[PDB]
């Protein structure tokens, strides 16, 4: 009873990291699927009976409490943004072809940074130093690596402007944040076209975040005239680590999985 | 000292419903703006010091707890959906020109209903009767009435399938929900092209929700074969009522207002 690719694919959809079953044992496909179908139905029934909270929603609310309690202002900015923002962020016409365009002059935001830069500039006229804000929400990029990449994902970006915007403080916040989530990490240098040199938060070979210590030459284009620090995290990658997901689609907005459990049962 | 339209507009941006000032008193524009600028700066500084939670985020989390505690499963489905969903929902090629199209075959969802219909169908194969789910998230419609309409708004849709899907139960949930938020309402009949007859939840002349008691002929197109009930609410309209906002843009995702306070200070 060798399994076809279509049969292995269907078993992999039903398989969860907590399972310890071999698909290549010689057991017939009919009894592997039935066993997996039964476990996943029990998993969902237990979710429906005792938790009912969505993984991505629950993680957003946990992160929201963490940063609100540490003095950061909670932001909810537009997801549909001017196409003008893209070229102003230094995305030359690369990442520019990853943009989902809407009508003629607008697009789906590929990051939170530009909306947050605007808020920092505006809030600095009213609030005392330092200015601390954060946002969690959908971002959109056309991608070509279906394993750690989604086209529709969830970003956290926290940032600070004014005093205390040092590398050591930025690392300290990242450390407190990931220690709160129970995720081990290392920091390695990297570079992107938008911000220059970055501090990349790595969990093994998985990039959890890119963080930046300003100032950078891009600040003038956005009216930023003070020291600042910031970091962007992918929530679906955080869930992938936390739940040992093989595929990041297990954690994404989807009609095909609920909290890592297949919905095709 | 008569005020120009541009001056009245700027004062209205700075004015909050709790204020009791006349713009047409004869006081010079310079001292009306300064007084309003000072009050709004104090409002934001107080927010930054003692709350820091975003109105739309906080309302989503309050509603989420309400429905999770009442046995509803929390859904987070794609915001970018197939264009195919639109014609299948009965939106003939009206509301069809309100759709924000993305690339060739996709669009920004104008409602949560189609994703939730799919989840009801799938979950019914695994979970016991009745199936109770809900989602809160962005929806998108091109609009032409800048007072109670936004192009980017936030929808709550809760729905149930199986037993207990009666008009009286649907009204009972709506009543418990709005009584929890402290909003008075009345129910009046209406009709839309997608679902047929609707029960519209009205706060005065403001439509807070359209609710539907199935079955409807559209069910077959989506594989729904059981009684069901559902209702969609606009969160920005709920905030407009709760905070006595003159304009619904005070409550929207925006870089121009934080929790109803102008950010151009
Ligand atoms: N397509 C995507 N799907 C899921 N998460 C993403 C995606 N793109 C970025 N992220 C997350 O957003 C964070 C900040 O965005 P950033 O621009 O640094 O991504 P990136 O450097 O392009 O990531 P990668 O090199 O993995 O493509 C990343 O560290 C990652 O966790
Ligand atoms: N453009 C919008 N901006 C803000 N909220 C909206 C918008 N469109 C719909 N809603 C909210 O979503 C709920 C359910 O959507 P529905 O399709 O019933 O809206 P609608 O009947 O088109 O509303 P209206 O008649 O006010 O345009 C509405 O009751 C309303 O509260
Ligand atoms: N996904 C991104 C996440 C980087 C976050 C850094 N930005 C930030 O935290 O917001 C404040 C801010 C934004 C923009 C500007 N600007 O443009 O001058 C100044 C200040 C990445 O790959 O690094
Ligand atoms: N903004 C909308 C909100 C209506 C909600 C009703 N729908 C629902 O609650 O989701 C379950 C569901 C969805 C679709 C179908 N279907 O298409 O057959 C069957 C069942 C309006 O103006 O009424
Ligand atoms: K058998
Ligand atoms: K694994
Ligand atoms: K998605
Ligand atoms: K004066
Ligand atoms: K008012
Ligand atoms: K908006
Ligand atoms: Mg990338
Ligand atoms: Mg990278
Ligand atoms: Mg990066
Ligand atoms: Mg309408
Ligand atoms: Mg209506
Ligand atoms: Mg309606």
UniProtKB/TrEMBL annotation, chains A, B:
<dbReference type="GO" id="GO:0006418">
    <property type="term" value="P:tRNA aminoacylation for protein translation"/>
</dbReference>
<dbReference type="GO" id="GO:0005737">
    <property type="term" value="C:cytoplasm"/>
</dbReference>
<keyword id="KW-0648">Protein biosynthesis</keyword>
<feature type="domain" description="Aminoacyl-transfer RNA synthetases class-II family profile">
    <location>
        <begin position="58"/>
        <end position="265"/>
    </location>
</feature>
<keyword id="KW-0436">Ligase</keyword>
<keyword id="KW-0030">Aminoacyl-tRNA synthetase</keyword>
<protein>
    <recommendedName>
        <fullName>Pyrrolysine--tRNA ligase</fullName>
        <ecNumber>6.1.1.26</ecNumber>
    </recommendedName>
</protein>
<comment type="function">
    <text>Catalyzes the attachment of pyrrolysine to tRNA(Pyl). Pyrrolysine is a lysine derivative encoded by the termination codon UAG.</text>
</comment>
<dbReference type="GO" id="GO:0043767">
    <property type="term" value="F:pyrrolysyl-tRNA synthetase activity"/>
</dbReference>
<keyword id="KW-0547">Nucleotide-binding</keyword>
<keyword id="KW-0963">Cytoplasm</keyword>
<dbReference type="GO" id="GO:0000049">
    <property type="term" value="F:tRNA binding"/>
</dbReference>
<keyword id="KW-0067">ATP-binding</keyword>
<dbReference type="GO" id="GO:0005524">
    <property type="term" value="F:ATP binding"/>
</dbReference>
<comment type="similarity">
    <text>Belongs to the class-II aminoacyl-tRNA synthetase family.</text>
</comment>
